[PDB]
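cache lookup: miss for this entity combination. No prior model stored, computing from scratch. Input as submitted by user K.M.:
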Amino acid sequence: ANEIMDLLRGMDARLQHLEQKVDKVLAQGSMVTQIKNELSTVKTTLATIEGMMATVKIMDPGNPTGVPV
Amino acid sequence: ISANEIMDLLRGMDARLQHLEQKVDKVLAQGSMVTQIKNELSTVKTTLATIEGMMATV
Amino acid sequence: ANEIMDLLRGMDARLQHLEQKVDKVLAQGSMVTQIKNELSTVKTTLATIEGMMATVKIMD
């Protein structure tokens, strides 16, 4: 009779910390955002470096270069 | 009498499971975000690999 | 009563569905491993780049 109710509260309790463990992982995401915002800056600075090196390579009079189209 | 309290606790169980469902769906969404960051960072890596070469010739 | 236990047969069926779905959520392990590998690679390759930049020669 009452044993089943006892184990029932036990289940409620178990699930209650299921929430906690999950609450933690949901909160683990902000780190991601910042990382996306900072990788945007990584993208733009890497593109700047790429364009600068392309300009350098195309600045050698030794090898004539042609603009596409 | 007890069956009424049991009804309430089991209904609360259902609600708790719905909460877990939503939170884990948000976890799937975060996973979609991390996969986007994956492909984009891979593109970043490939671009950096492409530039290391000119480093010497120039 | 009986109605409640039928509601829990439905609700824990939803529970098996929940665990089935989070089985897919488990997949990001090797995923984060891969992203760690790529960025570490990025770090190593930019190491070479900064290494060759500091030099006495002037670019021609």
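stored under new cache key. The longest helix of chain B spans residues 2-52.
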